From a paper:
TRIM E3 ubiquitin ligases regulate a wide variety of cellular processes and are particularly important during innate immune signalling events. They are characterized by a conserved tripartite motif in their N‐terminal portion which comprises a canonical RING domain, one or two B‐box domains and a coiled‐coil region that mediates ligase dimerization.
The TRIM25 RING/UBE2D1~Ub complex crystallized with two molecules of the TRIM25 RING domain and two molecules of a stable, isopeptide‐mimic of the UBE2D1~Ub intermediate in the asymmetric unit (AU), related by a twofold symmetry axis. Rather surprisingly and in contradiction to our SEC‐MALLS, the RING domain is a dimer in the crystal with the dimer interface burying ~1,000 Å2 of solvent‐accessible surface. Similar to TRIM32, the dimer interface is formed predominantly by hydrophobic residues (L4, L7, L11, V68, L69, V72 and F76) that direct their side chains into the interior of the four‐helix bundle. Each RING monomer contacts a single UBE2D1 molecule via the conserved E2–E3 interface that has been observed in other E2–RING complexes. Similarly, in the TRIM25/E2~Ub structure each ubiquitin molecule is folded back onto its E2 in a conformation that resembles the one seen in other dimeric RING/E2~Ub complexes. A similar arrangement is present in TRIM25; however, in this case a charged residue, E10, located in the N‐terminal helix forms a network of electrostatic interactions and hydrogen bonds that stabilizes the observed RING/E2~Ub arrangement.
Author numbering:
A (entry chain E): 1 to 146
B (entry chain D): 3 to 82
C (entry chain F), E (entry chain C): 1 to 76
D (entry chain A): 1 to 79
F (entry chain B): 1 to 145
Write the structure that this text describes.
């Protein structure tokens, strides 16, 4: 049953705050959370603070949670609606994964995108033909959060 | 004093001590219910939750009786 | 020189390594303790993944550092 | 530490009668030392039978060591 | 009513049964504890094997008795 | 390694005292044992004591031990040479079996023979056609040994 797993993840998350994120529910419903992750230290997302939404299904953790950015981010695998096209959030999901592990997995996605099968084609095209222009665009978007 | 043993006997799916655990051929343990519920909501290749070992047919696994007795003895030591 | 690996289930294990050892060597020691193949291991340090072939010195990983283990992933 | 004294018989292999050495678990749920079971099946070819329940395996099962069970035996022996 | 069963590995287990329970019912409870199917079990008491379909009272098995478990054999 | 397995069996067998079964090396060769089993009560073998020899192979416990009677016994699966035609002593052997379990298995074979696939055909024929005379013949050999 889903609620118990969510409760224990939250209590372990409160007992020890991981350095890479901060997560917690929005109100009374623990099936809806708000998370915030920090950008990698040596990248185009330095010092950035990115907010995300976590929505747990009723059959969690046997089905993956729906996770989407609310902060705007320049990335080939994250569209303007904040949707994240990532394998561990669909077919490659494992019930042994925790929200802390997924958020940390999303952190490593920022500096390791897949421009060959992208969610935003024009951003991936810039990444392949001019990575310097890509870095400045991502650096600029982190300063603006828009 | 029984904390390293406690984490070692906790299921990676329900985050609680093992309840009638089963062991996959890849050497990973799960509650009989947790692993059954994982592979019931899907089909196709069945993947191990901890190492993604591929099983084209769903493996037929029985409960690790030695591991059951260990968990049962662990609960007594943790209660007294 | 001892390092720590935050395994997939949140558990912490201790590894005896050297700054010259590659990440492929580190994943082999992780495989021996946890049973997850190196091709399914994704080690994360300082928010970024650690690629095979590089050493611990290339990533500035020193004494008592903690690596984080997640499953292999790919962007889409 | 081990607040558990009867754990010794539960952690002893049914072949070598010693604590488990890198135990593997068969699909029928029985544990043996990695070397003890491989020596059983290298001598007993053809259909491979479990030593404890005679579960029949036509093809030799590919088994990796039960890492949780290795950690329990090690913490038991270090105490 | 409490009886004891010496398992195949020499370990002793405890079962709570009744004189009405058959040998096949006891072998089912042994399967829950040891994981050996009843058709591979051969229970021995007072030097004789216990036939399935017969009850514990038919063999005069009383409280704190000790049944011995060997593997299914076949004379020749 | 066989000798350590044999020593651990004997060590447990000294705290075991199993019923109807006694065994242990008489000499200094632990690969050769002397065993005594008692005839099951309420049977043609009741009160009898039967001696056996156990010879462990070099591959023990991955190969079965060679066990044979030295006392003469009236049974369709045990000939005059003490040879025991039992499946667990051959193809149905399991490395998880110990000598205490095997001797106990042999004890249960006395009152549960297999006359259809016999080692002594004529004793099995008397068992098939006249079990009352069979029990009388087996009780006579128990007193005569
Ligand atoms: Zn579980
Ligand atoms: Zn696995
Ligand atoms: Zn088995
Ligand atoms: Zn062994």
């Amino acid at each position: 049953m889903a609620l118990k797993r969510i409760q224990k993840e939250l209590s372990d998350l409160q007992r020890d705050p991981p350095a890479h994120c901060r997560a917690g529910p929005v109100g009374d419903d623990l099936f809806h959370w708000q998370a915030t992750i920090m950008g990698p230290p040596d990248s185009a997302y330095q010092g950035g603070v990115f907010f995300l939404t976590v929505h747990f299904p009723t059959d969690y953790p046997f089905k993956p949670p729906k996770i989407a950015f609310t902060t705007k981010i320049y990335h080939p695998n994250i569209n303007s609606n904040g949707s994240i096209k990532l394998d561990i959030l669909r077919s490659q999901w494992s019930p042994a994964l925790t929200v802390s592990k997924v958020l940390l997995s999303i952190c490593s996605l920022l500096c390791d995108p897949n421009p060959d099968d992208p969610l935003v084609p024009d951003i991936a095209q810039i990444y392949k033909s001019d990575k310097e222009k890509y870095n400045r665009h991502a650096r600029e978007w982190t300063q603006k959060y828009a | 004093e029984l904390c390293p043993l406690a984490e070692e006997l906790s299921c990676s799916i329900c985050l609680e001590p093992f309840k009638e655990p089963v062991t996959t051929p890849c050497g990973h343990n799960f509650c009989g219910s947790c692993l059954n519920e994982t592979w019931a909501v899907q089909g196709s290749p069945y993947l191990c939750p901890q190492c993604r070992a591929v099983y084209q047919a769903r493996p037929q696994l029985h409960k690790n009786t030695v591991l059951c007795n260990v968990v049962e003895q662990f609960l007594q030591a943790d209660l007294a | 020189m001892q390092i720590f690996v935050k395994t997939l289930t949140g558990k912490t294990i201790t590894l005896e390594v050297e700054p010259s050892d590659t990440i492929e060597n580190v994943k082999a020691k992780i495989q021996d303790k946890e049973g997850i193949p190196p091709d399914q291991q994704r080690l994360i340090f300082a928010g970024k993944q650690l690629e095979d072939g590089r050493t611990l010195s290339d990533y500035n990983i020193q004494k008592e550092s903690t690596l984080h283990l997640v499953l292999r992933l790919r962007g889409g």
